[PDB]
Design a binder for this molecule. Structure first.
Ligand SMILES: CCCCCCCC/C=C\CCCCCCCC(=O)OC[C@H](COP(=O)(O)OCC[N+](C)(C)C)OC(=O)CCCCCCC/C=C/CCCCCCCC
Ligand SMILES: CCCCCCCC/C=C\CCCCCCCC(=O)OC[C@H](COP(=O)(O)OCC[N+](C)(C)C)OC(=O)CCCCCCC/C=C\CCCCCCCC
Ligand SMILES: CCCCCCCC/C=C\CCCCCCCC(=O)OC[C@H](COP(=O)(O)OCC[N+](C)(C)C)OC(=O)CCCCCCC/C=C\CCCCCCCC
Ligand SMILES: [Zn+2]
Ligand SMILES: [Zn+2]
Lengths: 48, 528, 146, 48, 49
């Protein structure tokens, strides 16, 4: 229900919420969330 | 339909992806359904003479090709068009045969300075039956070409219009192409499509008659209900006053009624699409050349190029050449540049050797200007077996002998040996690439299910399990038949499962297609 | 057996039995199966070559006839393209077998009003017939092997 | 040889994940599982 | 010879056996010069692969 309520914010931030997986210090696969900047994403999409 | 299915499978497996696989499948099913509707509509309720050598050779080639009152007028016209639509392909084969016969007869022309500085082109035949035969065959060929155009227009143009309308409707309803976005101004297709949007008959072939409303309601709040109404040429005032109170006047049936009931804007849009269709243009060019053949009989030779389009084996052999056509053209350009460099060197240093004249009084220097030298090189050295050195002068006993032998050997190796080797290699690799694509299609279809994607081994756990799964459980024909049945059945008569699938289909959600799952996996333990 | 009997009527009919090596030797049978694997495609390619050469013959007959004089005696010309049958035979028999196409055998185009049209004619003949179609034949055989 | 190299690259990228190396079938156990894994879970762009 | 035996032996034009001879020469060119040599090149090219 909360996710349905917050769908707008999640959609707005979808292109900027970067997500990766690592083998953490706990010896388990952990998922890390961080911020991707618009400039970085545009540079990534640049054809070169 | 089997050929269409095979082509669709080939396309999906080779060039198609995986996220759009079900989208392409549903599009193929829709096209097949429309084609079947069209089919149902049309369906009715010693010494040897050179000529002696010529007659026998022609039979051999043909064998290769063969091996590989208003109411009364309306009914008659419909019968005629249905006949043409049914026999379209037969008419094309007949046109090809007529072209071959005409060209065989053409092989007997002769040219003289006297009647049978102008010249007489006359047919030289002992029998004397060939010239009347040529006349009748040319007339019949032109007639058959016209009939082929009509047959195409009545049989295959409807599918083109259907596909265009379907794509435009989907773009309007799920992309807001003319509402949220705009064409890119280089997309001539969309720019032209901007003409049928307001037309009263936008969905004439596409069966979805609710497109205008669907789009209006979906994008209506953001753009208002008046901008969308203006763009789609739909009147909300009508939509309401019609429900409130309306009349059914019946116009007097007649040609006047037919004339007033003509959507010029749609018709104009329809003609643009047709005249931009490739196959229709090919048929029109065929007709034009056939007409020109009555102005000059030798224009009928152009119709021998129709073998590439007609014979399937030849089409594949030529697709081998055209698979790397861009690379072949670029290779020819590279050859031109290399020969230009050689021309530059020859013009600057080796000019004394380019005298192609035997009369010492009248020299003929082919490399005293760059244009002439380049033409000489490209025209003669490339075609020579050993390069330019075969044709230009001998270098022996000259101060530049070694420079020249290096020049000639490098020309031979780079131009004659390598670049031509590149061309042969492009063709030879095209053959192998096409074979590999076919093998990949076969391997995929025999290793995994098209619908769910599960491997063959899991199903083969049971005797002939994969065969049963692909023939009964997950069958492409059954899925297409279900789409047809669901489209024809009334929404009021839809059952719960049918209604669910119908809603998902209307919303273009392909999650009802099983993916990585099946009945056997779902109920594995109970079934076991 | 029939050819063996005919060999007693004429001894040279016994040469027909040398074709038995294809049936007998296994290695030769495989090498020839390489050729016959795409036999239909090879035959259709030869037919396509015939059609293309016919088109070139049509063009030459209509426009380039002055260049098809294969005679050295000015008193006795030998025009090989004054009729379509003769011109087609000349093309198929001589241009195809020529190393650089028809241009190797028919007259020089230099110093003529149709020189550029003719050089285009000859280059296109060389590229389409000599280079590409023969490349198609070699490619069919090479792909059969693979 | 060049064509074969290109085909091998395509086949690898469509059969196994670049990061973890697990095969596509395991992920495809779920609808579009491999696509989701390679677009959201283990994404080279996200790692960079 | 580049075009087979026909390149070197006499011209067939204007002879009672002209068509038999042109068939002879064309078949020689296609079977010997074009195909068998194509077989040799194909054997080498397939060995590479
Ligand atoms: C890959 C396979 C290898 C190919 C091997 C070689 C290919 C040869 C190709 C093409 C045909 C060329 C023309 C053949 C000759 C016909 C000439 C003709 O027409 O003259 C008819 C004669 C006239 O009588 P005469 O008085 O001059 O007798 C002569 C008495 N002498 C010979 C003792 C002096 O009648 C006769 O004797 C004829 C009686 C005998 C009939 C057979 C003789 C010719 C056989 C040719 C091969 C079969 C066709 C090849 C198919 C193409 C290749 C796939
Ligand atoms: C989508 C695929 C496109 C493919 C395009 C290829 C189509 C072929 C090409 C071009 C046609 C251009 C038409 C323009 C000419 C207008 C007509 C014209 O003004 O014509 C004048 C002369 C005719 O002379 P006349 O008045 O004395 O006739 C006697 C008639 N009386 C006695 C009544 C005077 O025209 C002549 O020269 C007649 C001689 C014509 C012989 C060559 C015709 C072409 C045949 C075979 C080669 C095909 C080429 C293939 C290239 C593309 C490969 C893909
Ligand atoms: C299932 C596979 C099928 C393969 C078919 C190929 C078989 C070869 C072809 C054709 C045979 C047709 C037989 C018809 C002729 C009837 C006999 C005839 O009437 O004969 C007349 C002349 C002989 O003359 P004479 O009376 O002066 O003899 C002196 C005798 N006294 C002195 C008693 C008069 O016949 C002559 O010319 C004799 C000269 C013969 C030399 C050519 C024989 C062929 C040898 C090599 C080439 C093979 C061709 C391969 C083509 C197919 C490749 C797959
Ligand atoms: Zn399945
Ligand atoms: Zn991964």
């Amino acid at each position: 229900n909360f996710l349905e309520l917050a769908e707008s914010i999640l959609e707005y931030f979808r292109p900027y919420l970067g997500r990766i997986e690592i083998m953490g210090a706990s010896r388990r696969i952990e998922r890390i969330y961080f911020e991707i900047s618009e400039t970085n994403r545009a540079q990534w999409e640049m054809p070169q | 339909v089997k050929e269409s299915k095979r082509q669709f499978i080939f396309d999906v497996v080779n060039e198609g992806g995986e996220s759009e696989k079900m989208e392409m499948f549903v599009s193929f099913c829709e096209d097949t359904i429309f084609e079947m509707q069209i089919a149902a509509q049309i369906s009715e309720p010693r010494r040897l003479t050179a000529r002696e050598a010529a007659t026998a050779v022609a039979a051999l080639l043909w064998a290769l090709v063969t091996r590989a009152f208003w109411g009364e007028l309306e009914v008659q016209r419909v019968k005629f068009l249905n006949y043409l639509s049914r026999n379209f392909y037969t008419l094309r084969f007949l046109a090809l045969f007529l072209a071959f016969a005409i060209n065989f007869i053409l092989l007997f022309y002769k040219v003289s300075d006297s009647p049978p500085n102008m010249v007489y082109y006359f047919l030289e035949e002992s029998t004397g039956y060939m010239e009347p035969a040529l006349r009748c065959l040319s007339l019949l060929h032109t007639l058959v070409a016209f009939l082929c155009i009509i047959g195409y227009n009545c049989l295959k143009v409807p599918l083109v219009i259907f596909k265009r309308e379907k794509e435009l409707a989907r773009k309007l309803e799920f992309d807001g192409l003319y509402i949220t976005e705009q064409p890119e101004d280089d997309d001539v297709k969309g720019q032209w499509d901007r003409l049928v949007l307001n037309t009263p008959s936008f969905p004439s072939n596409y069966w979805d008659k609710f497109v205008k409303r669907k789009v209006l309601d979906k994008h209506g709040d953001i753009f208002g209900r008046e901008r969308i109404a203006e763009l789609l040429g739909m009147d909300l005032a009508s939509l309401e006053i019609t429900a409130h109170n309306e009349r059914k006047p019946d116009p007097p049936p007649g040609l006047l009624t037919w004339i007033m009931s003509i959507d010029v804007k749609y018709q104009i849009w329809k003609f643009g699409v047709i005249f931009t269709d490739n196959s229709f243009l090919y048929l029109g060019w065929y007709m034009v050349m056939s007409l020109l053949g009555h102005y000059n009989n030798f224009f009928f030779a152009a119709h021998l190029l129709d073998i590439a389009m007609g014979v399937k084996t030849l089409r594949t052999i030529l697709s081998s050449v055209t698979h790397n056509g861009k690379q072949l053209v670029m290779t020819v350009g590279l050859l031109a540049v290399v020969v230009y460099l050689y021309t530059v060197v020859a013009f600057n240093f080796f000019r004394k050797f380019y005298n192609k004249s035997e009369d010492e009084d009248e020299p003929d220097m082919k490399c005293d200007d760059m244009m002439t030298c380049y033409l000489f090189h490209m025209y003669v050295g490339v075609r020579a077996g050993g390069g330019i050195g075969d044709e230009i002068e001998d270098p022996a006993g000259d101060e530049y002998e070694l420079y020249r032998v290096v020049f000639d050997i490098t020309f031979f190796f780079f131009v004659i040996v390598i670049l031509l080797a590149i061309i042969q290699g492009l063709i030879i690799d095209a053959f192998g690439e096409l074979r590999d694509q076919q093998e990949q299609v076969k391997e995929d279809m025999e290793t995994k299910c098209f619908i769910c994607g599960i491997g063959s081994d899991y199903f083969d756990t049971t005797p002939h399990g994969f065969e049963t799964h692909t023939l009964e459980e997950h069958n492409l024909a059954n899925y297409m038949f279900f789409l047809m049945y669901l489209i024809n059945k009334d929404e009021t008569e839809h059952t719960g499962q049918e209604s669910y699938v119908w809603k998902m289909y209307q919303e273009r959600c392909w999650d009802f297609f099983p993916a990585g799952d099946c009945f056997r996996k779902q109920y594995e333990d109970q079934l076991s």
